[PDB]
Amino acid sequence: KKYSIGLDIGTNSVGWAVITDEYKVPSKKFKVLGNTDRHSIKKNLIGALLFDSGETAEATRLKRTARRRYTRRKNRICYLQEIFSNEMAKVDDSFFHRLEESFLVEEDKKHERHPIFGNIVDEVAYHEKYPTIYHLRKKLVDSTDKADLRLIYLALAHMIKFRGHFLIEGDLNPDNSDVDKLFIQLVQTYNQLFEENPINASGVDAKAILSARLSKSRRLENLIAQLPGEKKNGLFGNLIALSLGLTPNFKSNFDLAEDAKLQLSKDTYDDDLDNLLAQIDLFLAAKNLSDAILLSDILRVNTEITKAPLSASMIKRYDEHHQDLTLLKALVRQQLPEKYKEIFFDQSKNGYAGYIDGGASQEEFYKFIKPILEKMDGTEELLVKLNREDLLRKQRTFDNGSIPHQIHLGELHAILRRQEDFYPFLKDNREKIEKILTFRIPYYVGPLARGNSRFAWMTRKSEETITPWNFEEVVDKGASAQSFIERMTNFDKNLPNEKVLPKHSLLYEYFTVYNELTKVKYVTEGMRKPAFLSGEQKKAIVDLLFKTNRKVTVKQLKEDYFKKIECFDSVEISGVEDRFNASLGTYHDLLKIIKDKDFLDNEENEDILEDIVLTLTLFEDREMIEERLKTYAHLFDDKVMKQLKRRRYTGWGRLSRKLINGIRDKQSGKTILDFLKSDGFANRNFMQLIHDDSLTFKEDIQKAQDSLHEHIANLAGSPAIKKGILQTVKVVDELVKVMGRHKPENIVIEMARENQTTQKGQKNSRERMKRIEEGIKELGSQILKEHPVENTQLQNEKLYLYYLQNGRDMYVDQELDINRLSDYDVDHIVPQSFLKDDSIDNKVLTRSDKNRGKSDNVPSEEVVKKMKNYWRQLLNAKLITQRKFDNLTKAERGGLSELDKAGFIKRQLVETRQITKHVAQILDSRMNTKYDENDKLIREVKVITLKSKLVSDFRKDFQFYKVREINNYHHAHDAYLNAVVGTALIKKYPKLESEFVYGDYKVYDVRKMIAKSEQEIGKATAKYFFYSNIMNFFKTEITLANGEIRKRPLIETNGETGEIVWDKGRDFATVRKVLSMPQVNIVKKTEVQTGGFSKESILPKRNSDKLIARKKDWDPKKYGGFDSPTVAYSVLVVAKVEKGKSKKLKSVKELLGITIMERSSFEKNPIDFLEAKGYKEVKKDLIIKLPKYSLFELENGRKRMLASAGELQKGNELALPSKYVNFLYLASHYEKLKGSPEDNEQKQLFVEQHKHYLDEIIEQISEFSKRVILADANLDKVLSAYNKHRDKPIREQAENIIHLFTLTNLGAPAAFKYFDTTIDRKRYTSTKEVLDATLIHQSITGLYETRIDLSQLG
RNA sequence: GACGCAUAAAGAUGAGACGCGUUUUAGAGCUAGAAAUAGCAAGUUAAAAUAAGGCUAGUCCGUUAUCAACUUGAAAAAGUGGCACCGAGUCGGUGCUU
DNA sequence: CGTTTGTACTCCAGCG
DNA sequence: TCTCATCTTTATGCCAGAGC
DNA sequence: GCTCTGGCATACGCTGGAGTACAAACG
Ligand SMILES: [Mg+2]
Ligand SMILES: [Mg+2]
Ligand SMILES: [Mg+2]
Ligand SMILES: [Mg+2]
Ligand SMILES: [Mg+2]
């Protein structure tokens, strides 16, 4: 009557099993409902629920943000049109109407078919005058003639619609820049300020640096060569301050007006200018030379007087494209006339015709045309431009993403300045148009909702509609920025109504320090035993060396404190290894700013400091920080406040202020922090304080603490794990309902946790700074010398990848820029679209235009061959792992293939861990509910949490081998073995319940301490060995390294009680028998499909009924549209259809797929929807919703799952005998058995003896296929391939036979191969047969069934 | 030693932006041609849409999570299916029992 | 003799 | 692809009396 | 004034839609 439940939870499965006290799996006769004649089923209480993994909300988020961007871009254009509308009605009242309907075909257009001018001659003239929009933009920027209002609008709308990025702050003005020759003005101003005969007659200016790769190196070299200045500052020192960042932390080179340091023109650079403004403008030349150099870096146009450098560069692209195209056409005609049509007319090839009119990108076009160019004559210039990626370029390409918005804003401002003379309305609202271009909702404001958004947090000062021009006066930006962070930070778990403290708050730092400090012990020569630090000693230590050293080493503690004050000549410290992990970093940072130490040490102003740190953590906008800190301006100097607003903290703690310093124990009146600072002689740390029954902290925490669906929905984190959590809780609930509504004795959950040796865990958690040091020193570069870095700074992804690559690009042999890292981007070696892998082995820092031409593919063979030596250098120095090197060189081993797809992603382990950890506490809360006064909670049900290592060792030791490829039974079997091993362990060692049973621990149970011996190897190694040896009571012979063996008893008893725990004779037979049960309740969860309506690709117009209109009024036969709609669910319709040459009502039964788009339309009124679909006399009461994976049973027990309205998945399981599974496991893995050499030899001999099982397994597969798969051609191919390779080695034959189970695997048909022969999918693309099958409705465990015989519907 | 701290791996959630891509239309094709076609010219750009759409009409929302069947119900939610034994090719049989 | 469903094979899927 | 912010799981290191 | 958890010894899963060609197969 007592029973246990095992669980094997995964991302797409939850295996479950019910066991009794004798480890047997029971079986019950279950009632089956429905109209069939079958009334009872015998079923074993073991099975697995399979489901589609919950998707992360990332793709939905990306779609939502893209939708918002499109909405706001349309709104920008609407604002511009509203500005232009009144004065456009003068010149062309239908202009904006023609712009709106430009998409429509001519018979749909209500106006003239030429959008801009509305007549053929003017339109042709315009396009001859301005072949590209950039011609018009440059003409409007440069010319003084009154232009047409329509042309002005077109240029401004092009700038506003495609307005460039906002990755650069400040005003990158073009008017006071773009001429690098103003360096002469820089040396002129230097000559004015520097009177000791400075250098003025220099050589060539920085144009040489620009013509080379831009860095500190070429700048220094060219300035040394051309500018032999009288001092370092003039020749090199000041120029970089106008063009580059400075690495050293020391003050700048020899002073010119003041001695302080120098930095590039950043956000804080203006305030840093006190070294000259308070001493004198030489530094004003930064705002000119810096912008000139930067825009010369962005754009390859500096030789022209134009005020539109971007439009000029695009016109140069156009001109070079034209010239190169003419030359290429001439060369092709005079050398390769037969190839002319292919290159220039056939747009299915990747020639120029496919480059312009086809789908060929310029990488495809270049790889097509490079062989052509190489074999002709006179193509040297074209080839050079090709290798430089500037051959026949388009004006709108992937690499335009580096254009800042300031360039477009400059062109727009120039146009408005030019044309405001003639159009007064342009002068009145020049700033409105500029604001339309430049306005951008702050990231901390979010969507500008008015109540009906679940993603919005913005608060508004007034009810006015928000525009770009009243955004400041309508949106409360301070409160919005506060709620931006406040809605994302955690609440204190102990006090769930109190927000956690900032990670860098002073109370949090003190709490951490004293929590670590309260447990360190010292022993002297004369002291009997190690003693705690007293409250006075902890006070003294903190004041002496925690408030004077940022990092406190044990050496400092035993030399600065103990030796010097309260003298001990030699002391031993326990409770810290080499350095206190705790620190007071915020104290030192605020001591640097506020030189007053007494202010920080004072206790009255603790609230002020907490508020200051909270402000510095919530906001990064210097204006908001200044406004918030302004209330304290009477406590600090103006300079001190200027320094505070620079200080920026991020990160939040785990505990609230009310917890660590707010609540008081009613007896002693002490807070938790007061106890940490002085707790008599007990010196309780944080976890002891909140768990003592003698103190009221535990009571206050406990008293400060619906439905299952609501509870799972309200869980924080990814919604991906909610699916697994809810499904396993529902499985447990159904299993409890089956077993007479009696709660299980135990629930055993397989956890993905692991015990590691201390060496492995210390090597896998080593600091990344250490990794960079050890790698750089190996290859000998001075990258750390040039750019010193700390481990904390390496949390930045791009900064970390910079040093991992030795400061070099991994795709082009070029050096990266540290200060300009935002203009590089992180590239996923194996593309995101293929496989989800965000690991460091997959990430590479490369240049933006290198990434964006390298689209959704591994690096090309050209890149691999160029870079294989540098990658080899990095691999030998261990900055990239072997897996990273394999990812980079993927093109050398055949590129992307389904083999790469066949491997668990790393997110799956994290998802499994999260699901299992959540469900452990969910089940512990739902099962154990009866509270008791003597002991708080009554543990009716023990939720055992087994590590996966135990069951895997059980399988491998006792030959219960697992092969995931044969069938889905391994989930249920893993659950069964989990139940067996967990219950056996709890019975044999009832004193391990504190660590295996969820929540049954007492804090710091010293009873389970490890002696000093066996700790010299490491505390985690001792636990690793303990857990390894804790499972030896299952085995009989325990073999030693020297050959001695202990024979364990055949019956294992509890030891103290004497209850039988494991009869090694009969219980192993019980386990073996259960793993050979052919009936296992494998159920695939039926799921109504949700997601995208169809495939996202817009297809060209086609006379087909599969196309879907992409707007309501756009006929897809004229405009194109989407196809491949996703079927939400199918419906079984029984009705009459008018068909035949003479249409007549023939009664029909069939499945109609209700796609996601039309799901709501169908659910509003099914009869109207079906009649409009063409069904007459629909029987409303016979409509059956059939979601995906609906199960039908046919003759000979053949089962099919509904993939869609016109496809079926195979729905049977191959219960292969356990002997064949073991033989497949042993024959494969032939030399990687990992056992003793004698055992490996014995297993190899067994495999060799039983080589006849290959024929037996093939017979199993063939009969199973002939019965349920019915893929006769594929089966014949499989049999022929097996007969061909029957003389291959047993290992290879067994390895390839495991692929054959892809033929029989439940689910969608998949392709597989047998040593070379690829067997492709036999898809069941007809759902006519299931219309007379038996529709199976299965409960969550599949034990409860309803069988509907569809042959009786008609 | 399930809290906390330090380190690290692997992931997650939300907001703000960029650049492409696709689709239809505009960018007068010319000559020889009954013409089917052939020769030549040309190409780089733009508008609009970018889940159909929705109503609470916001510069908002629309692809995550929730879903066996049946009976109750405005819905959350509740309720529905006997046991033991011998066996095992996807569960069968036997015997008690309602 | 003309449609009309089964097989069978190929291709494709927005992205950086 | 970029910027900003927050959060989770797991591993290792430090943290362990006490009644008989 | 001490052994205790134990025995005494260690290195997580994966395809449906659409088109085209061709052959039975019904009307
Ligand atoms: Mg598992
Ligand atoms: Mg990429
Ligand atoms: Mg599993
Ligand atoms: Mg879904
Ligand atoms: Mg821990």
Coordinates of C-alpha atoms (C1' of nucleotides) in Angstrom, one line a residue, chain A residues 28 31 38 42 44 55 57 60-61 64 67-69 72-74 99 102-103 109 113-114 127 133 158 161 163-164 329 333 341 344 357 395-398 400 439 441 443 448 450 452-453 466 508 654 709 718 730 765 791 838 840 906-907 969 994 997 999 1019 1088 1093 1098 1101 1110 1112 1119 1213 1215 1260 1345, chain B residues 1-28 40-53 56-69 76-77 79-81 83-94:
Chain A
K28 CA -3.7 -2.0 -12.5
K31 CA -11.2 1.9 -17.3
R38 CA -12.7 -2.0 -25.2
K42 CA -3.9 -3.5 -18.0
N44 CA 2.2 -0.8 -15.8
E55 CA 10.5 28.3 -26.0
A57 CA 10.5 34.5 -24.7
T60 CA 8.9 37.1 -29.0
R61 CA 10.8 40.0 -27.5
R64 CA 7.9 42.9 -30.3
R67 CA 7.2 46.0 -34.2
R68 CA 7.7 49.0 -31.9
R69 CA 10.5 50.2 -34.2
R72 CA 7.8 54.6 -34.4
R73 CA 9.5 55.0 -37.8
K74 CA 6.1 55.3 -39.5
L99 CA 3.6 58.2 -51.7
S102 CA 3.1 53.5 -54.3
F103 CA 2.8 49.8 -53.5
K109 CA -3.9 53.4 -57.7
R113 CA 1.3 56.1 -61.2
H114 CA 4.4 58.2 -60.8
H127 CA 15.6 60.0 -62.3
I133 CA 18.7 59.7 -53.5
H158 CA 15.2 59.6 -46.4
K161 CA 13.5 57.1 -42.1
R163 CA 18.8 57.9 -39.6
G164 CA 21.9 56.0 -38.6
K329 CA 31.1 44.7 -69.9
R333 CA 32.5 41.2 -74.6
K341 CA 24.6 36.4 -71.2
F344 CA 24.7 40.0 -67.3
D357 CA 18.1 41.5 -59.9
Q395 CA 24.8 52.5 -52.0
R396 CA 22.6 50.6 -49.5
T397 CA 24.6 47.7 -48.1
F398 CA 25.1 45.6 -44.9
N400 CA 26.0 51.1 -43.6
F439 CA 14.7 62.0 -30.8
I441 CA 13.0 57.2 -26.3
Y443 CA 16.0 52.9 -22.6
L448 CA 5.0 55.2 -23.9
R450 CA -1.2 54.8 -21.2
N452 CA -2.7 48.9 -21.4
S453 CA 0.8 47.5 -21.7
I466 CA 3.7 62.3 -26.1
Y508 CA 26.0 45.5 2.7
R654 CA 20.8 39.4 -1.9
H709 CA -1.2 27.3 -12.6
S718 CA 12.3 32.1 -18.2
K730 CA 0.6 17.4 -13.0
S765 CA 36.4 28.3 -11.6
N791 CA 39.8 40.8 -13.4
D838 CA 26.5 31.5 -26.6
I840 CA 33.0 31.5 -25.2
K906 CA 24.2 23.8 -23.3
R907 CA 21.0 25.7 -22.5
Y969 CA 11.7 4.0 -22.6
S994 CA 19.5 15.5 5.9
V997 CA 15.7 14.8 1.4
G999 CA 14.7 20.7 3.4
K1019 CA 36.8 19.2 1.3
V1088 CA -2.4 23.4 -29.9
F1093 CA 1.2 32.8 -38.5
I1098 CA 7.3 37.4 -48.6
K1101 CA 3.2 37.1 -56.9
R1110 CA 0.0 40.3 -46.3
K1112 CA -6.3 43.0 -46.3
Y1119 CA 1.2 41.5 -54.8
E1213 CA 7.7 2.3 -29.5
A1215 CA 10.4 -2.5 -27.0
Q1260 CA 13.5 -7.1 -34.6
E1345 CA -7.7 6.7 -21.9
Chain B
rG1 C1' 27.8 23.4 5.9
rA2 C1' 20.5 24.1 0.7
rC3 C1' 22.0 31.2 3.6
rG4 C1' 25.9 34.6 2.6
rC5 C1' 30.6 36.1 0.2
rA6 C1' 34.6 35.3 -3.7
rU7 C1' 35.5 33.1 -8.4
rA8 C1' 33.8 30.7 -13.0
rA9 C1' 30.9 28.6 -16.5
rA10 C1' 26.2 28.1 -19.0
rG11 C1' 21.9 30.6 -19.6
rA12 C1' 17.5 34.1 -18.8
rU13 C1' 14.2 38.7 -18.7
rG14 C1' 13.0 43.6 -20.2
rA15 C1' 13.8 48.3 -22.7
rG16 C1' 16.0 51.5 -26.5
rA17 C1' 18.2 51.8 -31.4
rC18 C1' 20.9 50.5 -36.3
rG19 C1' 21.8 48.2 -40.9
rC20 C1' 20.3 45.0 -44.5
rG21 C1' 16.7 41.4 -46.8
rU22 C1' 12.0 40.5 -49.2
rU23 C1' 7.4 42.0 -51.8
rU24 C1' 4.5 45.5 -55.4
rU25 C1' 5.0 50.0 -57.9
rA26 C1' 8.0 54.2 -60.1
rG27 C1' 12.7 54.7 -62.7
rA28 C1' 9.3 55.6 -71.0
rC40 C1' 22.1 46.0 -78.5
rA41 C1' 21.2 49.3 -74.3
rA42 C1' 20.2 49.2 -69.1
rG43 C1' 21.0 48.0 -64.0
rU44 C1' 23.4 50.8 -58.1
rU45 C1' 17.8 54.3 -56.3
rA46 C1' 13.0 55.3 -54.0
rA47 C1' 7.8 54.9 -51.9
rA48 C1' 5.0 51.5 -48.9
rA49 C1' 4.5 47.0 -45.9
rU50 C1' 7.3 44.1 -42.7
rA51 C1' 3.2 39.0 -38.8
rA52 C1' -3.6 39.5 -41.1
rG53 C1' -4.7 42.9 -37.6
rU56 C1' -8.8 50.2 -23.9
rA57 C1' -7.1 54.6 -29.8
rG58 C1' -1.4 54.3 -26.5
rU59 C1' 4.3 57.1 -30.7
rC60 C1' -0.2 50.9 -27.1
rC61 C1' -1.0 45.5 -28.0
rG62 C1' -0.5 41.2 -31.5
rU63 C1' 4.7 34.7 -32.2
rU64 C1' 6.7 33.2 -24.4
rA65 C1' 3.6 30.6 -20.6
rU66 C1' -1.6 28.5 -20.3
rC67 C1' -4.7 23.4 -23.7
rA68 C1' -6.2 14.8 -23.0
rA69 C1' -11.7 13.3 -22.8
rA76 C1' -11.2 30.7 -11.9
rA77 C1' -12.2 26.0 -10.3
rG79 C1' -15.7 16.5 -9.9
rU80 C1' -15.2 11.3 -13.0
rG81 C1' -12.1 5.7 -13.6
rC83 C1' -8.4 -5.0 -5.5
rA84 C1' -5.0 -9.3 -5.3
rC85 C1' -2.3 -13.0 -7.9
rC86 C1' 0.1 -15.7 -12.2
rG87 C1' 2.3 -14.2 -16.4
rA88 C1' 4.6 -10.7 -20.8
rG89 C1' 5.7 -8.1 -27.7
rU90 C1' 3.2 -2.6 -26.3
rC91 C1' -0.3 -5.7 -22.0
rG92 C1' -3.1 -10.7 -21.3
rG93 C1' -5.6 -14.0 -18.0
rU94 C1' -7.5 -15.8 -13.5

